[PDB]
Symmetry: D2
Subunit: 328 residues, 4 copies
């Protein structure tokens, strides 16, 4: 009897770097197992939109995106010996928001407690500069200070305007505490970049007392790693920024892979980029003011994902109050 | 300065050629060599002069009567728009859009709360001015209802203009704990919740009106309840979407419009919460000197409002339900 | 044996005008039948969110919304003798638009042909003033002229700015052909209202040659009925406008009930109001630039409904070109 | 007028205190009592002066070298923003938002097409200026690809700046008739269409680059094809969302940025089509004198662009796929 599920997988060597052989299997985001020489191999690093490369003599297998496939790599093809292991809703802003924020706070508190007990898991934030423009920067910094955040994935703008807020009270020249523009404020963000360039990097700015508050400050003080991916729209960038997209992508992937939850705060491109890198067993909270953006995040979803159509500015402020309440 | 040109209306609701069509700004007219202050500034209307009474008023075209003296052309008029800032703007600056969600929210909530506190203080002193709310049912759907009801309870609110949907979902949540069958406290749909909205309308129809439902103990909490208890007037305008308007609803749009105008025109501030229809309808009725705040999650709503003449509006592009919860906390902070 | 489906329906008299008895049946938008004194009655005027009132001695039944229920009316309650007869997709702007417009044009052409042969059916438009502001007014007027449109449901603003365009070339003072504002143009729409008030109504304005082009003109010339529902935001209004919402609602309901298709063009409140009045057997095309608006229209849908997230201005222009192509 | 103050950079990418941070406008600096025109106007950058060469240029901070003389403060500078209109605006007017979908679309399409026709004529005469397109993959998803490819074919387009997604979906539609597995001609998903996108990337990887795929007969139609055939340069910037960038993609954002800057800075017009990332990235690199048109279905996209300094942008809030189809028809009308 031929039963594809328990037949040995078929493999084909890639004929060129980054060229997938005909019949290649496209991965889900689910933990996958492949049968090779009569033994089930657990495929490392689950990720959607990739192929599986097999190392039969090492009895190992890993997920590889196309750009990392090398000539000679044995790519899984066909339909035999593939076992997928999945882990065990209309988008609208018109849903009770205090309620969902309270429920999110409860979940974060439970995740943080388990991280404290075990030292693994925890929460990554994917953040864009709207967090700062909407006045949500201090709330997010306080979450980092309270131990809720185990990593931040962002880019030059979030870091720059968070630092501009610290140094000058403004984001793109708008005063955070009053929402009024400051005369000549257009230069403030370039002055912030210059200040970090002079310090050498963010760590130096913090350790030397140039930078004394805010998200990046809290990350340095609490040893929270962050990844700042460079973008074609960047001013500067600051020294910490990884300018090559593919390098930044690799670093993002390794940063999120062991988290229990990723919270995506209003940045479609960074949030999609991050979701693309996540296995299905990570919980996702997707937050944006545009329903179409949230929808695009709810489309490539992990098995546990919620979308909240709301303004990150007020969302972060109320969320922090709910977290502060739980601290008591 | 020439005296204004005046010509009598030849028939009800028909105006002489060259008639002046008003801005939303206070306007004065020169009549028998004196400046007369035109009563009730409001855009897209006409100025009717009563020279023998030394008065003039802003009348909508459908209220103009045969023989009314209508201001013609632009001579002998003085229009007073809001004060321009003391200095020209900067050459180069960022984030200066009139309408965008990318603006510091805690800052603007603090500022709005300080102004509402000041305005409530003055209303308590004078018995005049005060604040009107214009609201849509998203206030309820997003969990903002309790916060707004509390502001009414605390004396911040002197009028509410809304429709059947706001009132009936507020009442749904008071009777059943849901809006659209979704539980306000948990954000989860409840079994049979799809019926709560019609049950709420049925209950008010049975009672006879909102006031009767409060008097009978049927309605015990919420925005409309607090209006009854605190004698805060409301105007509920009927709309073509209503299959079950409650008895309080004014089904004729012009009767509703006229009542809305007299309700808002003496307020110090109008806060518009998640309603395109009512934001624009109310702005169309308001003079430019009333502080106007338009809160919605859709920037296109605030832009539509400003595009239709309400250029004094301060837009806050944000989630109304979270905004109301935070605003209340800030008002409570100030009161302490 | 008791088989609810074929048991005689239970009825209860309403105890007060507009008060539904406990247990009332809430209607679908589907053709419904009720069993009364051992005979199946076909319920007139299917409509969702209503009750069914029965006249046993007349062997008839109709759908009544709550506001029309009268003391003594026998309202259908309970679970016996109710037979519903239904007639025999993710919302996104990122879908091939020329393609869907071509398909819509084909469908309209087939519907118009059948209306021409039979004299019944055809197409109603639900329209708001954005049709005029976006420069789509001439395209819609040409559809009326070509015989595609059997009714228009709108309000004071669409009519006012269509007439302002005819008389002065502007909508709210913006020139339609150049998109430039005209100095002093803010008065133009009130002048348009005044011009119709002087003529007496739209029909008089057309018959007297005051109004010589545009949507309202084409409706008068081609005997297309329209319903203009008054709104609290109205300037004027013009004489044709029905200022009472409930009267306007009744007139809208009777206008749409015999149509084969309703096309809803960017007006959330009018489009929802209209959808609420339609039986399930009418085809719907829902068009708006906001995904959340289209979603709200796709929620209360007839059994055949499509949503198109697009700008009505360019949509109408391209749609007309496709219809003009079919004319040849 | 004082001569400008200059101070040398103390280290690479570190500027002296008080350094001038540029606008997006042409700027002149007074050096040894002569006005020098600062090369390559671009915002959020610095002005480096070479007094002995009687020249100055706008350098981004990361290209500033130890010892470069950097303009300090605001003396001895002359900034030339776009010409202001001959008269102040009206007191009271409607629909004057910078960004709204409620504006006459046929009118603006006609105007854009006339300008593109004029600009193409001048480019054919001079070999300089011309038009760049900045585009996102929604061009393809909405059925606008064929229209844009035709504009390239007809000589309207001198450069394309985009990402992997635009190029690879264009190529998907050329090879398979789909974008995201949805058939362009029918708007229906096709069986197995979810694979077409990776098949298209695989095909280009196999060929070696886009040019090779065209030369081999693999790629026979579409935007990238027309760029190859007509020798129109493109810049495809890599992004962190790319798991399969094709070989043409520049993965380093600063290398991509520098190439984009030199590509756009000599154009007469830049048309940005459905891309927040590239609209803002390109606007950040552009002087204010280049005609800038930003087309998107989301008004917040155009507002974000203008909020970040590109205040010369003309926003067209519309469906890009329908817009491109209509624009092409108007260009074809003018050519006849
Ligand atoms: Ni889930
Ligand atoms: Ni259907």
């Amino acid at each position: 009897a031929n039963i594809p599920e328990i037949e040995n997988a078929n493999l084909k060597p890639a004929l060129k770097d980054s060229v997938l052989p005909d019949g290649f299997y496209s991965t889900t985001n689910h933990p996958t197992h492949v049968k090779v020489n009569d033994e089930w191999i657990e495929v490392a690093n689950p990720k959607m939109d990739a192929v599986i490369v097999v190392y039969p003599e090492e009895k190992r297998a890993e997920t590889k995106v196309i750009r990392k496939v090398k000539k000679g790599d044995f790519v899984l093809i066909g339909h035999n010996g593939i076992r997928v292991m999945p882990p065990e809703s209309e988008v609208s802003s018109e849903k009770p928001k205090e309620a969902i924020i309270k429920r999110i706070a409860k979940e974060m508190h439970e995740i943080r407690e388990e991280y404290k007990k075990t030292g693994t898991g925890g929460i990554a934030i994917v953040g864009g500069p709207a967090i700062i423009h909407t006045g949500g920067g201090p709330a997010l910094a306080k979450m980092v200070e309270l131990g809720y955040i185990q990593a931040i994935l962002a880019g030059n703008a979030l870091a720059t305007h968070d630092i501009e807020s610290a140094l000058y009270g403004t984001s793109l020249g708008v005063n955070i505490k009053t929402a009024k523009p400051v005369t000549g404020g257009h230069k403030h963000h370039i002055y912030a970049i210059n200040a970090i360039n002079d310090a050498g990097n963010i760590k130096n700015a913090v350790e030397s007392g140039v930078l004394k508050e805010g998200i990046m400050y809290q990350c340095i003080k609490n040893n929270i790693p962050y990844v700042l991916a460079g973008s074609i729209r960047d001013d500067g960038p600051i020294p910490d920024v990884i300018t090559d997209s593919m390098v930044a992508q690799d670093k993002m992937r390794t940063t999120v892979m062991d988290k229990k939850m990723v919270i995506m705060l209003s940045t479609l491109l960074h949030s999609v980029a991050t979701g693309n890198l996540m296995p299905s067993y990570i919980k996702t909270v997707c937050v944006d003011i545009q329903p179409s953006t949230v929808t695009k995040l709810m489309d490539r979803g992990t098995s546990q994902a919620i979308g909240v159509v709301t303004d990150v500015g007020v969302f972060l402020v109320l969320l922090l109050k709910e977290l502060e309440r739980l601290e008591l």
